Design a protein around this ligand. Structure first.
Ligand SMILES: Nc1ncnc2c1ncn2[C@@H]1O[C@H](CSCCCCNCc2cccc(-c3ccc(Cl)cc3)c2)[C@@H](O)[C@H]1O
Ligand SMILES: [K+]
Ligand SMILES: [Zn+2]
Length: 256
């Protein structure tokens, strides 16, 4: 299932599993798993000749295989994408509320009145153009247009998780499925934030207590890697994340 990502997201282990899969799918002479000691990003840099030299018995086959994979990327499993999207949503909105301590959250495009951070100290308010009739009693029926509402919802923060509107207001958190709509915002770079306790990896994007000293505990390490797999699955599927321009990860480091 890892291979259902674009090869540019493949790890060293993924490339090796790719070999094993192809050896059985195409009945190839078996190649050593370390025939391509590299990740998919490096794999996309090699020439077909490098394939022939690294595997004289099946290198050309594998190259054209990689090319057929790039020419027709595999469709994603909807349940794994829902879960990925839900995981990133909770991560990101939780961090923003902790960084900037917004008093109100305006959730625009949420027909089910479900909080993605139920434990947060904030007033949560829901809006949707077509609310679920079983949740409309606590949802404002509203079609957001920047032209009509740019003067409203100016307190706290607005959340547009896959609610594609004409233009997002400046105090927004946005997920968008595939640039004039995003002028008030900036791209959200990757980060992982956790305040769960440490229990017994190097990267500047693992915002955890154990990484203040650079010695991330085994637990947050595993949780970081799970979160990066979910994030990659979402980005690889065509989502992008946008945020209010004052978003600052150093505010999250200050929570420790
Ligand atoms: N202009 C609008 N103003 C207000 N509401 C407006 C406006 N346009 C549209 N809507 C409403 O948004 C909504 C249009 S997506 C309806 C699903 C809920 C969106 N978020 C909740 C959520 C949570 C987790 C995952 C996902 C998710 C991830 C990937 C993909 Cl592929 C699809 C969904 C979504 C409907 O409720 C529309 O009636
Ligand atoms: K606003
Ligand atoms: Zn830790």
């Amino acid at each position: 299932a890892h291979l259902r990502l674009q090869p540019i997201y493949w790890s060293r282990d993924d490339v090796a599993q790719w070999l094993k899969w192809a050896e059985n799918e195409f009945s190839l002479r078996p190649i050593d798993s370390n025939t391509f000691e590299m990740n998919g990003k490096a794999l996309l840099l090699l020439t077909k000749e490098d394939f022939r030299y690294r595997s004289p018995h099946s290198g050309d086959e594998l190259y054209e295989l990689l090319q057929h994979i790039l020419a027709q990327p595999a469709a994603g499993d909807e349940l794994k994408i829902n879960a990925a999207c839900r995981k990133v949503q909770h991560m990101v909105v939780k961090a923003a509320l902790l960084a900037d301590k917004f008093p109100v959250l305006h959730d625009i495009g949420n027909p089910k009145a479900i909080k993605c951070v139920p434990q947060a100290d904030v007033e949560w308010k829901f809006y949707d153009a077509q609310p679920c009739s079983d949740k409309a009693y606590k949802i404002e029926e509203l079609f957001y247009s920047y032209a009509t509402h740019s003067d409203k919802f100016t307190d706290g923060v607005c959340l547009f998780w896959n609610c594609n509107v004409d233009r997002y207001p400046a105090n927004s958190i946005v997920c968008r499925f595939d640039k004039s709509a995003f002028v008030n915002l900036k791209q959200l770079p990757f980060f992982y934030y956790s305040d769960s306790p440490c229990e017994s990896l190097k990267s500047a994007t693992c915002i955890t207590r154990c990484n203040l000293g650079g010695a991330v505990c085994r637990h947050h390490a595993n949780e970081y890697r799970l979160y990066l797999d979910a994030y990659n699955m979402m980005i690889s599927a065509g989502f992008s994340l946008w945020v209010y321009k004052q978003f600052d990860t150093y505010n999250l480091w200050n929570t420790f």
